[PDB]
Amino acid sequence: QKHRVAPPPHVPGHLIREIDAYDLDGLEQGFHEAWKRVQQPDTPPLVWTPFTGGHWIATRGTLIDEIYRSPERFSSRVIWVPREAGEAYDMVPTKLDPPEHTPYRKAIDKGLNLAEIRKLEDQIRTIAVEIIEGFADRGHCEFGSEFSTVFPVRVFLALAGLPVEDATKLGLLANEMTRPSGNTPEEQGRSLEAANKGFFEYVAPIIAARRGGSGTDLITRILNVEIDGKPMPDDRALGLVSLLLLGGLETVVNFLGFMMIYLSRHPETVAEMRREPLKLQRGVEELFRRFAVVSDARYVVSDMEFHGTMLKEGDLILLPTALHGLDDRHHDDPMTVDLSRRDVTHSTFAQGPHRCAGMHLARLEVTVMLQEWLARIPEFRLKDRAVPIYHSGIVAAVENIPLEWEPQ
Numbered sequence: 110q111k112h113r114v115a116p117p118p119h120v121p122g123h124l125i126r127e128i129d130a131y132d133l134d135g136l137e138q139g140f141h142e143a144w145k146r147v148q149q150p151d152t153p154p155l156v157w158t159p160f161t162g163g164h165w166i167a168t169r170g171t172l173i174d175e176i177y178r179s180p181e182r183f184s185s186r187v188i189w190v191p192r193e194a195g196e197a198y199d200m201v202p203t204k205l206d207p208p209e210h211t212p213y214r215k216a217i218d219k220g221l222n223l224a225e226i227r228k229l230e231d232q233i234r235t236i237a238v239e240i241i242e243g244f245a246d247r248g249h250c251e252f253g254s255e256f257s258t259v260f261p262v263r264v265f266l267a268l269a270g271l272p273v274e275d276a277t278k279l280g281l282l283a284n285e286m287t288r289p290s291g292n293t294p295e296e297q298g299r300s301l302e303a304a305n306k307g308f309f310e311y312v313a314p315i316i317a318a319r320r321g322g323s324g325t326d327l328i329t330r331i332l333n334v335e336i337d338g339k340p341m342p343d344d345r346a347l348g349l350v351s352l353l354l355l356g357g358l359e360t361v362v363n364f365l366g367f368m369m370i371y372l373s374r375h376p377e378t379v380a381e382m383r384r385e386p387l388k389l390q391r392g393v394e395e396l397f398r399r400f401a402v403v404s405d406a407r408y409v410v411s412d413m414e415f416h417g418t419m420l421k422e423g424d425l426i427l428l429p430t431a432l433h434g435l436d437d438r439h440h441d442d443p444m445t446v447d448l449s450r451r452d453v454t455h456s457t458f459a460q461g462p463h464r465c466a467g468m469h470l471a472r473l474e475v476t477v478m479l480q481e482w483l484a485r486i487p488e489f490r491l492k493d494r495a496v497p498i499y500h501s502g503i504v505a506a507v508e509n510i511p512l513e514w515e516p517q
């Protein structure tokens with residue numbers, strides 16, 4: 110039974126749509142397919158749902174892109190639905206608008222910029238190869254539990270200088286951040302609050318140990334960047350390091366599952382990558398267009414009319430990033446991966462000042478993964494009659510991906 114709120118006076122009945130971002134209609138056929146059901150030919154650009162506390166949903170790529178690019182009109186002071194969870198959320202610098210955001214993003218970029226990420230290629234490759242060689246001769250694996258949940262976590266924990274044994278603890282907190290438990294906005298607010306506290310408890314001793322530290326790990330490097338000519342304050346550092354863990358543990362893991370389910374059903378596309386290695390390298394961004402996983406929100410700063418829609422200060426707008434990359438008004442045949450597509454524009458990493466700081470790392474992990482996978486498992490398929498299981502939320506998830514091949 111679903112919790113419902115009544116529409117506020119400024120929301121007209123013709124814009125109401127019953128959409129549950131934490132359990133989308135049609136989700137059993139796929140996360141991306143379920144969001145695409147919302148984006149019908151005559152669907153208004155902004156629709157309002159009475160679920161998850163009541164909130165708007167942007168249904169077209171142009172609005173999603175514009176909202177992300179417009180922090181003065183759409184603030185990050187709340188970026189989660191329901192509102193109770195968004196108010197409890199404390200990660201840095203995602204809760205900040207410019208100019209407070211700027212010095213912290215500069216600090217993060219010191220650790221995650223493209224030049225720094227390029228240095229990581231070979232250690233990423235050795236992690237990938239080690240895992241793949243564990244099952245490549247077997248002729249089958251469960252891709253989720255044997256690879257996609259293992260490879261990016263091992264990469265990030267090594268990069269962050271953290272013990273691999275912490276993977277389970279951190280994954281459980283991350284699950285409750287992005288798909289918080291509860292049948293009620295207040296309940297989900299409390300679940301996110303508890304997970305966010307778990308992250309802060311975990312990172313606080315690490316921060317204390319690495320301030321002024323001599324380590325070369327990502328945390329030491331970012332933590333010791335000065336903010337306004339001074340050491341980063343404790344409150345900001347806790348949210349900053351927690352956000353790095355959240356991005357490192359619950360983004361690429363889920364992206365890889367969706368990507369691999371598609372490739373397993375499209376052997377002609379896999380064969381193109383095999384025959385043309387540059388098409389793989391140049392085609393990775395088209396994968397990011399096609400397999401968005403994040404759906405988060407912004408806070409309407411002022412009463413306004415936006416794309417013909419009356420919004421009130423404090424209204425929340427959910428931005429399902431899949432509805433940019435998969436918008437048929439932006440991309441012809443949007444559900445098809447076309448490695449040669451010239452225009453790959455998407456909001457999978459969002460836009461504007463908060464555009465994903467980890468995107469260089471994400472791109473490199475995916476590129477190295479495909480290169481090492483195809484070198485050892487060049488052909489593969491989804492097990493006959495297998496049914497992946499899908500979850501929707503602020504970050505989408507998929508599990509049960511049994512793959513099969515003839516060992517080479």
Ligand code: HEM
Binds near residue numbers: 466
């Ligand atoms: C498939 C992979 C990934 C996707 C789809 C993704 C998506 C996103 C999105 C949509 C945002 C903007 C959130 C908002 O402000 O509303 C973001 C921000 C961010 N991401 Fe990623 N991300 C990915 C990988 C990573 C990785 C591996 C890291 C490594 C730590 C990371 C770190 C960050 C950080 C620090 C920010 C905050 C940037 C800021 O506020 O200025 N992300 N990401």
Ligand SMILES: CC1(C)[C@H]2CC(=O)[C@]1(C)C[C@H]2O
Binds near residue numbers: 360
């Ligand atoms: C929405 C995000 C994916 C993005 C900002 C968050 O809080 C994330 C959950 C991690 C980071 O990459």
